[PDB]
Curated annotation (Swiss-Prot), chains A, B, C:
Its EC number is 5.3.99.6. The chain holds residues 81 to 253 of 253 of the full protein. The lineage of its organism: Eukaryota, Viridiplantae, Streptophyta, Embryophyta, Tracheophyta. It is found in: Plastid, Chloroplast. Belongs to the allene oxide cyclase family. It comes from the Eukaryota. Highly expressed in fully developed leaves. This is Allene oxide cyclase 2, chloroplastic. One of its GO terms (biological process) is response to cold. The gene is AOC2. It catalyses: (9Z,13S,15Z)-12,13-epoxyoctadeca-9,11,15-trienoate = (9S,13S,15Z)-12-oxophyto-10,15-dienoate. Induction: High local and systemic induction by wounding. GO terms for molecular function: allene-oxide cyclase activity. The four allene oxide cyclase proteins (AOC1, AOC2, AOC3 and AOC4) are encoded by duplicated genes. They are very similar, and most experiments involving antibodies do not discriminate between the different members.
Length: 173, 173, 173
């Protein structure tokens, strides 16, 4: 198992999330669909790597936990390294595990599961991929000690500003 | 190769399905989308395990078969044990096989295919997963000899009424 | 590793694509959904094999490339042989690699990545699957030397006319 951590951050500049409201209730419900796309940074918050991209399908409102259950299908883009694909539960109200369905580039053959940690709605999430099946060891620029997750985390000013020292080459946008 | 069978049943108490009707045609056609969530029971019908949850994309009406072709992306939830994800053909008029795209929990690393039997369209479905890649033998409460699939199958009265003896631990709802 | 190549062609007879417009923009943007289904032929263009079926989710318009980034979830159908499932990026203006999420039939246990080549927008596409995990060698009727992809390629007359000699058995339609 090779562990890989990343932060997903919504910077309010990619028109995301887009809510397609089809359930008649004022709350989320079955029928509602949410395409989305956020920014992706290294687990140490030092570099911009790319984006997340996909779709959340609303399954049910959970009024007792003041939250929503989604079923999610989406990918994680790492510039020229390639991508990882996932499929599973996305709960606004608690942490979950999603299936790693595959990948490409350095992530060709990837399998296992990924932990998703909800930090701040709708702006900050943290992930740890428990990666099996890769052909090589992950590149060192992706495997720095992660910053421990909290509501207060922020990307390095260099990474937010897209300075040469704060991005990977051909990071996805 | 480890066999796992489950019964999916639509008890019409989960606001499911929700039909999003967009096609040019009066009948089902490309453009139509069907988000869904049904209840899930063990192969021996003794216990409630959880739910199914996902999306069917209508591909074409099949007038010579008196039904429809769907392309389906969905997950199967097993309370505390984790989940299994699938993709592939959902045909209203005949049995099909879907790809197992991955899993999480005891289903971390899952691969193979699953047989979908259209027992009573659209209310009762019976599945048989041909599961490879699991870390360990499946828990016994999930592997009781399945009840042979027939039109009049019913869950155990305790499974239906959610009594301790008829539910798995923290079964998905 | 077993290579498999196929041509996907929109022959304008399958009601496809169907654009579902929700972005408040004159161009494609997040919220736009595109269900689709095209015809599939062998890499040597000698036989009709089946169809593609699935969904493209618009991520963003890409002004400087005069095109779009989609996130795509779809299957490849090969008649009685089975199906492959994929997830990943679909860029209208350049080639990409997608993840092979799984398979059924002869493709039970498939994994790896697939190269998508944008030949003529959006009507002809050429794919090469880099297939791992198959239980057996691929059938010879599927592994003829591919015709090198070009704007001017065409299926064999026998294939287009649906003669027994130009189709696989029970080719998907
Ligand atoms: Na393997």
């Amino acid at each position: 198992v090779q562990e890989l951590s990343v932060y997903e951050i919504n910077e309010l500049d990619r028109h995301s999330p887009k809510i397609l409201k089809n359930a008649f209730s004022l709350m989320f419900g079955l029928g509602d669909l949410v395409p989305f796309t956020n920014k992706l940074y290294t687990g140490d918050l030092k570099k911009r790597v790319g984006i997340t991209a996909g779709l959340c399908v609303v399954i049910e409102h959970v009024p007792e936990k003041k939250g929503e259950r989604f079923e999610a299908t989406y990918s994680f883009y790492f510039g020229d390294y390639g991508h990882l694909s996932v499929q599973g539960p996305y709960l606004t109200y608690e942490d979950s595990f999603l299936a790693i369905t595959g990948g490409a580039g350095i992530f060709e053959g990837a399998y296992g599961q990924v932990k998703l940690q909800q930090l701040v709605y709708p702006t900050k999430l943290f992930y740890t991929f428990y990666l099996k099946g890769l052909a090589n060891d992950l590149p060192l620029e992706l495997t720095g000690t992660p910053v421990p997750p909290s509501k207060d985390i922020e990307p390095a000013p260099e990474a937010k500003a897209l300075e040469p020292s704060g991005v990977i080459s051909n990071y996805t946008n």
